[PDB]
Design a protein around this ligand. Structure first.
Ligand SMILES: [Ca+2]
Length: 161
């Protein structure tokens, strides 16, 4: 009963509540190949308990605070990590924070926005249909800020950067 949800064939989103054994049980039972930890707490115990091979556990220290830019600062690196684990190494990814509703959900939504070239509201509803998420307002503006709307042939086409 570790609280994480399958979002699509490639991604899980969840939290962390201090029971690494439950988390390890979820990861191993569900064949999760890679874990991204987006937390402001100590990650070494999670890394140790999961014991994944070198390179299959990534940590970015980041807060959920209109003041911390660390998730935004690392969005490109995080995206490329997911893309290479999913497409080149064929792994599923657990993205987690503490509650699994804002930090982790923000990266999952962005991965779906950019791989599908769809806007925030479309990706958010897709994810929210599988797990009730609620990105903080500044993460919503971050993700919306990645979308460009360009005029062509009497339409506005969205591009996700
Ligand atoms: Ca949290």
């Amino acid at each position: 009963m570790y609280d994480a949800t399958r979002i699509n064939q490639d991604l899980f989103v969840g939290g962390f509540y201090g029971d690494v054994i439950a988390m390890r049980h979820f990861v191993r039972q569900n064949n999760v190949g890679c874990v991204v930890s987006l937390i402001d707490s100590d990650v070494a115990p999670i890394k140790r308990a999961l014991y994944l091979p070198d390179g299959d556990h990534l940590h970015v220290h980041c807060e959920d605070d209109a003041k911390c830019g660390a998730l935004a600062d690392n969005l490109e690196m995080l995206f490329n990590y997911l893309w290479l684990k999913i497409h080149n190494e064929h792994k599923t990814v657990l993205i987690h924070c503490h509650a699994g509703v804002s930090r982790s959900a923000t990266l999952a939504i962005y991965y779906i926005m950019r791989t599908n070239q769809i806007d925030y509201e479309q990706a958010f509803q897709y994810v929210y249909g599988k797990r009730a998420v609620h990105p903080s307002e500044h993460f919503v503006e971050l993700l919306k800020g990645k979308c460009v709307y360009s005029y062509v042939d009497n339409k506005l086409v969205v591009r996700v950067e």
